[PDB]
A = this chain, B = another copy of it.
Amino acid sequence: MRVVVIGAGVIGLSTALCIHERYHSVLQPLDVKVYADRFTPFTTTDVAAGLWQPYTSEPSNPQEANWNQQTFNYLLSHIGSPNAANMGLTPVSGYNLFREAVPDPYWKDMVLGFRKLTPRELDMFPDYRYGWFNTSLILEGRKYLQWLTERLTERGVKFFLRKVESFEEVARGGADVIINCTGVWAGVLQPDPLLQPGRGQIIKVDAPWLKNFIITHDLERGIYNSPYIAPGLQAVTLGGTFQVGNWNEINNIQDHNTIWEGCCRLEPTLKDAKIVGEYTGFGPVRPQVRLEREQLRFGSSNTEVIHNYGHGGYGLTIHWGCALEVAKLFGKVLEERNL
């Protein structure tokens, strides 16, 4: 059939590949197109800090916690392969700092080497008085997208620069199944007021001497609203602002002063570090991920649509669970239609 995938971020390409891997052979070719108005380096995925860490509390949906662990073990299976780093993948250890005792997270056993910080370690951080150490994985969004873009291309999947104006335009274009991987902009094709823009701004620096990640938490302020330092492959990511409901795509001086001063308080060696750039992106924030099937009809046309959007703060930490799951839903469509 004719599958169209709208969106070239981590969700869009994890999904296009996951589907194509399973539902393709040499005498059952599955025609996949990828329509998208933004490709790497210009997606929200290229901004993502890179790191694998879910939210501290165990999530409401029991499927989301599976999607996290399935994602972790999928990436961890590549650690030791010659091409881990070429996917944007490498191991990284680090600190999570709190201003007060909190329960161990639900993923203490998912990560490698979890443990509490000793008193000696906590004096390294004057402003904080409790926390953890653990080993995890960098998945550099910019790289992973380059790699996924190439695996798709080897397999014959084709890409088109195209702003989809409605699901119908793509339906009349002659598309049997559509995968809706438009992230924060999903609300334009079909309204969805539960989906807000999580506006985060980051500073990227050269500070290759920084090797561990350092993630502070403010529980009052919620996730990403407190300084984090994340070592990348070529550069350190500096962050600490996340504004839910702000659609301003401009970088601004208020966020710079917050990220810069907060991060220099943790890591004073950053006074020298050259700023390479500053970027803003929109987490597709949503109380839950919309990952479901929905048939549509129009005047001269009708179609099958699968949603994969609203991952918010955890696109890379969950993309593969979400993709495996879309490919099953897609399997159901081919089962029901005698293909």
Cβ of A208: which chain B residues have Cβ within 8 Å of it?
208, 233-234
- Nearest B residue (CB) for A140: B209
Cβ of A211: which chain B residues have Cβ within 8 Å of it?
90-93, 211-212, 231
* Cβ-defined contact, A86 with B272, below 8 A: yes
Cβ of A233: which chain B residues have Cβ within 8 Å of it?
208-209
Given contacts A83-B269, A211-B231, 19 further A-B contacts (CB under 8 A): A81-B268, A82-B268, A82-B269, A85-B272, A86-B272, A90-B209, A91-B212, A93-B135, A93-B212, A112-B118, A112-B121, A113-B115, A113-B118, A113-B133, A115-B115, A135-B212, A208-B233, A211-B211, A211-B212
Cβ of A210: which chain B residues have Cβ within 8 Å of it?
90
Question: Could you say which of A82, A135, A271 has the most chain B C-beta atoms within 10 Å of its C-beta?
Answer: A135
A124 close to B (CB within 8 Å) = yes
0/1 per residue, A71-96, Cβ < 8 Å to B? 00000100111111110001111000
**Whole-angstrom distance between the Cβ of A194 and the nearest chain B Cβ:** 37
Cβ of A268: which chain B residues have Cβ within 8 Å of it?
80-82, 84
Cβ of A86: which chain B residues have Cβ within 8 Å of it?
269, 272
Task: Tell me whether chain A's interface is mostly helix, strand or loop, or mixed.
Answer: mixed
Cβ of A193: which chain B residues have Cβ within 8 Å of it?
none
Residues on A facing B (Cβ under 8 Å): 76, 79-86, 90-93, 112-113, 115, 117-118, 120-121, 124, 126, 133, 135, 138, 207-212, 231, 233-234, 268-269, 271-272
Cβ of A209: which chain B residues have Cβ within 8 Å of it?
85, 90, 138, 233
**Whole-angstrom distance between the Cβ of A236 and the nearest chain B Cβ:** 11
* Closest A-B pairs by Cβ, 4 of them: A82-B268, A85-B269, A85-B209, A90-B209
Cβ of A272: which chain B residues have Cβ within 8 Å of it?
82, 85-86
Question: Could you say which of A121, A124, A210, A211 has the most chain B C-beta atoms within 10 Å of its C-beta?
Answer: A211
Complex Cα spacing A212 to B211, Å: 7
